């Protein structure tokens, strides 16, 4: 399955494809009859292995040469060793986090399903790049301290401008996160130095505690593969959920449920909403089928549901567990909150409305996030630090420790702060 799961995180115009291939061998993609843009804009994945010879290097699947293919005019090459037998370090897979702040709820969810972060940096915009606070301040508030930095698109950038970038970032983080994350430089075009990223995901990142025998918990985000061909057109395979198990051993034929579920038809409102549950039909990980599974790793879980739920990611940010589980389900929320010391998202040569956030009012709709879920929140009562709200879809958590808060401060919502349940 896996020992750890790592989120590749960044900002607009930094690229994706070359570096996600360099750390895994897998092209991150979403299927569309259209050209591939500079970024995978919405949350994805890349399956991987990490392995070495007897001496520090990251080989190809043929071990004798590191020979590249990312540039048409050159063959950059080194010898890891004289065709030595490879050794696996540990089982790992990557969470391909969103490329634009428009998906900030899905980004907080991606940052919750990872055990650690890779934060990606590029020369395409001015030095004090703001997502170095925006991700890492939320990541500290969701208590996930495990962080690394990766300087990607610098193929034509001088060492003094590469310095000015990391040094204006090192000055900027003083109010938002600890400086203690290592930086790895690479080439995006030449695949130079990329095996140091592999070494640092062994060097910096610990294996986290989980309970192997306590009651099942799972986070789901992805509608996994089901396909059109068949002699029976309905329910040939059933819908498959992509997720990561938080807690408990899991097995084929176990009854599993999703906590927020759905609102029942012919209800007059938020009443009569219920969980949804079924027996697990199959399991998938590491390009193999399974009968059993464990906490701490990315997995595909097979279910009896209609594939019409799976033709798109309807299942973004959902919490799952054993049938009839305890954890409280919220369709309305009691909140206490705090706001960021600057407005955030983009920057240039001098101030662009970067002042402190204006207080909330009841005539508005929030986007609000809890655990690894998301919902839209409408106000019943509020003050500048405290409130009471009703939710357009239900949400769930094992404890009400934290929430994250986004406001329509302009045409689409931006993060403005965080809070707790009362």
């Amino acid at each position: 399955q896996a020992t750890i799961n790592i989120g590749t995180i960044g900002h607009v115009a930094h690229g994706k494809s070359t570096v996600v291939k360099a750390i895994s061998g897998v092209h991150t993609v979403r299927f569309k009859n259209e050209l591939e843009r500079n970024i995978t804009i919405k949350l994805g994945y890349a399956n991987a292995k990490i392995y070495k010879l007897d001496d520090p290097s990251c080989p190809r699947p043929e071990c004798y040469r590191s020979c590249g293919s990312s540039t048409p005019d050159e063959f950059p090459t080194d010898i890891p060793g004289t065709k030595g037998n490879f050794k696996l370090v540990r089982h790992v897979s990557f969470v391909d986090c969103p490329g634009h702040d428009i998906l900030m709820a899905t980004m907080l969810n991606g940052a919750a399903v990872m055990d650690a972060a890779l934060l990606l940096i590029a020369g395409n915009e001015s030095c004090p790049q703001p997502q170095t606070s925006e991700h890492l301040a939320a990541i500290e508030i969701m208590k996930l301290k495990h962080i690394l930095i990766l300087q990607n698109k610098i193929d034509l950038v001088k060492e003094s401008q590469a310095k000015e970038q990391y040094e204006q970032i090192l000055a900027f983080v003083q109010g938002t996160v600890a400086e203690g994350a290592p930086i790895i430089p690479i080439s995006a075009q030449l695949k130079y130095n990329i095996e140091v990223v592999c070494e640092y995901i062994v060097k910096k990142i610990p294996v986290p505690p989980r309970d192997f025998t306590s009651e099942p918990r799972l986070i789901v985000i992805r509608s996994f593969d089901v396909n059109k061909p068949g002699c029976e057109v309905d329910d040939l395979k059933g819908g498959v959920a992509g997720g990561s198990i938080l807690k408990g051993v899991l097995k084929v034929g176990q009854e599993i449920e999703v906590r927020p579920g759905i609102v029942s038809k012919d209800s007059e409102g938020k009443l009569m909403c219920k969980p949804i549950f079924s027996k697990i039909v199959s399991l998938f990980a590491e390009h193999n089928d399974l009968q059993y599974a464990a906490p701490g790793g990315l997995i595909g879980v097979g279910t009896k549901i209609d594939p019409t739920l799976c033709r798109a990611d309807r299942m973004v940010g959902q919490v799952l567990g054993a049938v009839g589980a305890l954890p409280e389900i919220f369709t309305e929320l009691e909140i206490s909150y705090f706001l960021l010391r600057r407005l955030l998202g983009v920057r240039t040569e001098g101030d662009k409305k970067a002042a402190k956030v204006q207080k909330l009012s009841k005539n508005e709709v929030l986007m609000v996030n809890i655990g690894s879920l998301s919902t839209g929140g409408r106000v019943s009562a509020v003050k500048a630090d405290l409130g009471k709200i009703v939710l357009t879809n239900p949400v769930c958590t094992e404890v009400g420790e934290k929430i994250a808060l986004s406001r329509r401060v302009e045409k689409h919502w931006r993060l403005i702060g965080w809070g707790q349940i009362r």
């Binding site: 309905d234 329910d235 038809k265 009896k304 209609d306 019409t308």
Partner: protein
Amino acid sequence: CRFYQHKFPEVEDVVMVNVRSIAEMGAYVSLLEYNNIEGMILLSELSRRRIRSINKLIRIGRNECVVVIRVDKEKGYIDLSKRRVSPEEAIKCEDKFTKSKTVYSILRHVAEVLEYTKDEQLESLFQRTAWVFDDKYKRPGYGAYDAFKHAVSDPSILDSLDLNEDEREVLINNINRRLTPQAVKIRADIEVACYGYEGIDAVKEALRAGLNCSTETMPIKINLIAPPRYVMTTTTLERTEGLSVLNQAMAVIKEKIEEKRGVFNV
């Protein structure tokens, strides 16, 4: 040879013709449903309004639709007109001609049996079977093409008379080589997406309950434009008969999930 019952055309009806020459008073023409007999279109009968050139109304070797305005039976004189013909009547003329050319393409080929020395065999093969198969129906408006279509579904039409084996097989083939694509002409459209958490077991009745009392071998054909747009074929029946099976299938498709705690728009 002649395609029809009678020696000469009747007055004030439409014939298919081919143009041979143009002169000072009119164009000279051969009628096609008769044995290439001579007739003429007068230049006064071509248009209701001024003519910019004649060559773009008529040119030699092209097929044309015209009414017969006068006939003298004894001398063999026939007068033709184009000013009269409406476009519905031109479509009707092409249907009469196509239904006749197909029947004639059977009989001309069936005649290549016995001695076949003279057109006497063509006229002898046209008489009896093919003539009594449509002389009875001139007023209703059918031709022997419909009797041949009846002889395809039941050969008792042929068994009623003196017969030849080419006259059986060539007749059948000139329908069946074109009629054998008796293709699908009805399918259903359904908006259903399924609530059932037991669906991979439960929906296998809704996929198979669509008709009662079949053989266990009986197929149906099922289709999909996208997952929320389900489609089914009504047991390969034609659009003149499958309308009952269409209404039953869509009702059964919704029933075998509304029976199972689903709810949908009727």
